[PDB]
Design a protein around this motif. Structure first.
Motif: not given
Lengths: 634, 460
Positions: A7-8, A78, A81, A120, A390, A394, A396, A402, A405
């Motif tokens: 994610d990060s 992200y 993904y 992802y 996170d 996640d 998310n 998402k 963003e």
């Protein structure tokens, strides 16, 4: 433990060579030039599919540069993904990249894009009877779900029910992988453990969001009126979360102060189904309900605000609801109003969950407002790209993908935001400040250039100026003496250091409705927090105020919105800095921030009638020196 | 630029006329005079008589007369003429050596220094013998400014650069770095740089065996025309041939191989004055082979490159990691501070960026140009030509590295009434000549264009 780099993981893939890295064979005949080592993708004017290329890059990655000649390329996990969740063919993007990108597709870059397009999430989280379960379209998915403590153990043995998958989807798993495959209906309780075990074992699951398995009952007392303010980023963010046909809650990272709840109220109304609203703290629940939700279509008669110091109508609340985290789960589970609302939260089946700043409060309680109820949807209106929630599972992949963003260029530019002007006046130098600069290298110079009586003067010009224009002035001055010295120098009913809130409110009433007081001074007590007042003319004096993440906050926080269009730059941002002082380094630090934020910015050091203003108190270098001696005390 | 024109007038009258001995150097000094001065030369080249100034004053009507004063002042300083207070009036006539040497060189005259070239089988190809001369400049320029490899082997050139202080580099330590003079070397492109170096060698090679007229005759012989055959062999003096061979070694003579042949009339002799097109193992990708990156985001986007060039770019920007097409470099206030540390003002770099790095910034400049000058009075907002956002940061950075100011002109007095000062000031802003003024002091320190015209209007 439960942390996910994916994610990060954004911020890499920009490093190449010249010996090993060859000029791309497409470089001769390629509209772009994909620098794979540098990760940069310059989309020059020669790309005919530049619009087509520009969109594809924005999905899989983040375009750092959008120059008129050529753009810039950055890598975002992200985004990877998200571009993986974008759905563009991983091979198809690469070849149009390869043919378009003159620089040949980098081997590492090519793998990531394909890894984006297919990975992802390759998880197999099956769903039964239009719900979420422990199964998988792929086999390694059914193994993950069945061998799952939350997915399997929390999964009821029933393969699927139209109502159970409808209702329960072991919470709401409206974020599962491909359904219509082998799986078993999961219970109504605890997808924290579902996600907390796919957490511990690193199951990147190719997830969806089945938005009318956001059905959840006969229709609630929802007034489907769009009279709540609509402005263009919200709607296309909605169009992203409304997707094809019907309302999908995704993750839509939205700011608090730009109409964040507005998308949630619409999506809550659109589903025409039971919905709860969660804001940060109960006191903010009322503030939020106060400052917009009655301007909004919402009738608060239905929305029971809860604190468990604030008992309200649980289990009888006919329409939508607004509660808060510390209520909805915490150590601050502190009267059986709280639990009974939660008992009602589990009792009533909820279609949609509007969430505001889940990141500040630990996810574990959110995982506990994700441990017990099993609604259908949530809505993550997140505020920061990277958050302490996170976790490798996640938030998310529990609310919806998402849809919105760090690319806040598509949407807000569609007409939501107005013009904001920023400026930075160079207050003229006077020997003592430098002698003051000379003598100490310490940070104690802080107020020593803040005090500049010439700085007071330029402020007063704006004051008479915005009084002449009938405008409103915000000044950001954390000093007490020199501010008082200045507020004494101005002599208007003035908000200042530790201003009485009533006097603040009185001056504010005498400030926004009354144009006589058209200057207030907000010290560091404005953030955080007050109900910050409207911004037409922001002046900032202090510039340390670290860290810089706050300076994004203050810039966002202090520059509030204005429903006045008499002035051509209805949000002035000003920064009175004594030129040739200690914070020229730090004044130059603020300028690069704003232009990165994109606010219209300028510099006005050739003031019209700089010495022609009233109250040239302390104008002389001597009195600036004298006030500098006055401020060396502070 | 040292404005070498000011050097010709500095050499006293005789060595000018001594210079004017060759109709080559008659015909040569003529092309640099201001166009008004040119027009006043040729008239009285042929009609063998002097002319009163009243006619020359009546020849030039209103504004443009400032060039009439521009013409006559440059004219007298280099003394190609003789003013004559014969009967209290002004009898204007050439330094006759100029006029007839001109007239000779006009009507096929005796400019044998001008006719010192020889025509033969001009085997020097367009590509042949100047790539050495162009590479001569490339190698020494990499040497002088400091390249990764400073291949400048001109020992006479290196002494002139260190001795003339051409680059603020430690000649004692062998440093070839850009000082205030070295920064000025980075500004005067082809003429001005070709001007600047010609001055250092003259200052350097001026102690013994100068023979300046021969030097100037020999310099004006090699650059006047392709001496071709018999230039370095015949049409060259002893010190001139040594200068020609030294110019040969410096490339400025593309003296052909064997060190004893006709003047290798390299194109370098042409560019020193031409102020025209500048483009000069077996591969040389051009013309746009050079490249750089300068945009609104204040960053280098390099795709084309040149080492000495990117070495020059690196002289005011950090280099981190040269990539396949890009060099990892980002221009900041810190990056230009590498040059401000050297005292390099953010003034010549202004003109540098608008001209240099264009081979990659063509479209970028072209999109910036937009032809927003005829649309300028139409659409009052010019469209970012030339980029102003960079210069203010440079100026503010320069202003951050500043606080010494001065003005030129001369303080003026005997302004008796307010009407004349008000009328003189009002006209001054019409032509733009007044730096600062005040009715209270009746004093200002500006040029004399104001004083010459009031005197001329009053006297004639």
């Amino acid at each position: 433990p439960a942390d996910f780099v994916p994610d990060s993981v954004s911020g890499m893939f920009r490093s190449h060579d010249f010996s090993y890295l060859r000029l791309r064979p497409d470089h001769a005949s390629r509209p772009l030039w994909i620098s794979p080592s540098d990760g940069r993708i310059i989309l020059e004017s020669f790309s005919p599919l530049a619009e087509q290329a520009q969109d594809f890059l924005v999905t899989i990655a983040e375009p750092i540069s959008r120059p008129s000649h050529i753009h810039e390329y950055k890598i975002t996990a992200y985004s990877l993904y998200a571009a993986v969740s974008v759905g563009l063919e991983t091979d198809d993007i690469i070849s149009v990249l390869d043919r378009l990108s003159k620089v040949p597709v980098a081997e590492s870059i090519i793998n990531f894009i394909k890894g984006a397009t297919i990975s992802y999430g390759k998880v197999k989280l099956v769903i039964k009877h239009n719900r979420y379960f422990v199964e998988t379209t792929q086999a390694d998915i059914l193994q993950m779900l069945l061998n799952d403590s939350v997915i399997g153990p929390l999964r009821i043995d029933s393969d699927h029910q139209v109502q159970p998958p409808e209702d329960v989807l072991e919470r709401e798993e409206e974020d599962d992988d491909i359904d219509a495959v082998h799986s078993f209906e999961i219970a109504n309780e605890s997808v924290e453990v579902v996600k907390k075990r796919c957490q511990e074992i690193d199951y990147p699951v190719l997830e969806e969001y089945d938005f009318r398995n956001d059905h959840r009952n006969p229709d609630l007392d929802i007034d489907l009126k769009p009279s709540t303010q609509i402005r263009p980023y919200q709607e296309k963010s909605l169009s992203k979360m409304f997707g094809n046909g019907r309302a999908r809650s995704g993750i839509i990272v939205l700011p608090c102060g730009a109409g964040k709840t507005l998308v949630g109220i619409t999506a809550a109304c659109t589903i025409k189904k039971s919905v709860i609203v969660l804001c940060t703290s109960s006191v903010s629940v009322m503030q939020w309900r106060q400052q917009f939700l009655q301007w909004c279509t919402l009738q608060p008669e239905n929305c029971a605000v809860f604190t468990s110091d604030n008992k309200e109508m649980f289990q009888t609340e006919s329409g939508l609801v607004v509660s808060t985290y510390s209520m909805v789960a915490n150590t601050r589970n502190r009267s059986h109003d709280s639990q009974k609302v939660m008992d009602f939260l589990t009792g009533r089946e909820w279609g949609f969950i509007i969430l505001d700043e889940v990141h500040v409060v630990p996810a574990a309680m959110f995982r506990r407002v994700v441990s017990t109820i099993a609604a259908h949807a949530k809505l993550g209106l997140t505020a920061t790209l990277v958050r302490e929630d996170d976790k490798i599972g996640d938030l998310n992949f529990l609310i919806g993908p998402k849809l919105y963003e760090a690319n806040w260029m598509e949407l807000s530019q569609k007409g939501h935001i107005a013009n904001v002007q920023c400026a930075e006046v160079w207050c003229p130098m006077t020997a003592e400040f430098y002698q003051e600069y000379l003598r100490e290298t310490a940070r104690k110079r802080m107020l020593l250039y803040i005090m500049n009586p010439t700085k007071f003067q330029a402020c007063q010009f704006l004051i008479q100026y915005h009084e002449r224009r009938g405008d409103k002035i915000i000044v950001f001055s954390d000093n007490v003496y020199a501010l008082q010295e200045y507020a004494l120098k101005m002599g208007k009913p003035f908000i200042y250091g530790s201003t009485p809130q009533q006097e603040r409110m009185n001056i504010l009433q005498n400030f926004q409705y009354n144009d006589q007081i058209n200057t207030i001074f907000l010290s560091k007590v404005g953030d955080t927090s007050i109900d910050l007042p409207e911004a037409t003319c922001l002046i900032q004096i202090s510039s340390h105020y670290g860290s810089r993440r706050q300076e994004a906050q203050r810039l966002g926080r202090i520059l509030r919105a204005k429903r006045r269009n008499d002035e051509g730059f209805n949000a002035f941002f000003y920064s009175l800095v004594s030129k040739d002082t200690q914070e020229m380094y730090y004044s130059t630090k603020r300028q690069a921030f704003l232009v990165d934020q994109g606010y219209a910015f300028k510099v006005i050091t050739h003031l019209h009638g700089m010495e022609n203003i009233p109250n040239l108190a302390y104008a002389s270098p001597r009195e600036r020196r004298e006030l500098l001696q006055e401020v060396l005390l502070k | 630029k040292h404005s070498v024109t000011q050097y010709l007038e500095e050499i006293p009258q005789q060595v000018q006329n001594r210079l004017y001995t060759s109709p080559a150097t008659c015909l040569a000094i003529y092309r640099i005079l201001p166009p008004l001065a040119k027009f006043f030369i040729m008239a009285m080249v042929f009609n063998e008589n002097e002319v009163p100034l009243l006619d020359l004053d009546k020849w030039v009507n209103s504004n443009g007369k400032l060039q009439f004063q521009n013409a006559i002042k440059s004219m007298k300083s280099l003394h190609l003429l003789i003013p004559n207070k014969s009967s209290g009036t002004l009898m204007i006539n050439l330094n006759p050596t100029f006029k007839i040497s001109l007239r000779n060189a006009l009507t096929g005259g005796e400019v044998q220094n001008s006719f010192g070239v020889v025509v033969e089988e001009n085997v020097v190809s367009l590509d042949l013998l100047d790539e050495y001369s162009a590479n001569k400049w490339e190698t020494i320029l990499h040497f002088m400014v400091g390249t990764p490899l400073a291949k400048i082997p001109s020992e006479k050139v290196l002494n002139l650069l260190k001795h003339s202080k051409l680059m603020e580099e430690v000649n004692s330590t062998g440093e070839f770095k850009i000082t205030n003079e070295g920064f000025q070397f980075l500004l005067q492109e082809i003429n001005s740089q070709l001007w600047t170096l010609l001055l250092q060698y003259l200052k350097m090679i001026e102690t013994s065996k100068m023979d300046l007229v021969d030097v100037l005759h020999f310099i004006f012989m090699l650059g006047a025309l392709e001496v071709g055959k018999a230039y370095k062999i015949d049409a060259l003096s002893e010190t001139q041939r040594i200068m020609l061979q030294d110019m040969r070694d410096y490339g400025l003579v593309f003296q052909k191989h064997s060190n004893d042949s006709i003047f290798y009339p390299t194109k370098l002799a042409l560019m020193l004055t031409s102020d025209t097109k500048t483009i000069r193992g077996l591969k040389n990708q051009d013309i746009p082979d050079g490249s750089l990156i300068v945009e609104t985001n204040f960053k280098i986007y390099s795709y084309s490159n040149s080492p000495l060039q990117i070495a020059v770019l690196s002289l005011f920007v950090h280099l981190k990691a040269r990539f396949v097409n890009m060099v990892l470099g980002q221009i900041t206030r810190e990056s230009i501070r590498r040059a401000l540390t050297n005292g390099i003002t953010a003034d010549q770099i202004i003109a540098y960026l608008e001209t240099h790095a264009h081979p990659q910034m063509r479209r970028l400049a072209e999109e910036k140009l937009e032809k927003k000058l005829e649309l300028d009075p139409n659409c009052k907002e010019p469209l970012q030509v030339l980029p102003p956002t960079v210069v203010d940061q440079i100026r503010l950075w320069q202003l951050e590295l500043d606080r010494v100011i001065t003005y030129e002109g001369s303080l003026y007095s005997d302004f008796e009434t307010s009407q004349e000062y008000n009328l003189l000031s009002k006209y001054a802003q019409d032509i733009g000549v007044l730096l600062w003024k005040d009715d209270k002091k009746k004093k200002f320190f500006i040029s004399k264009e104001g004083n010459s015209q009031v005197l001329d209007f009053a006297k004639r």
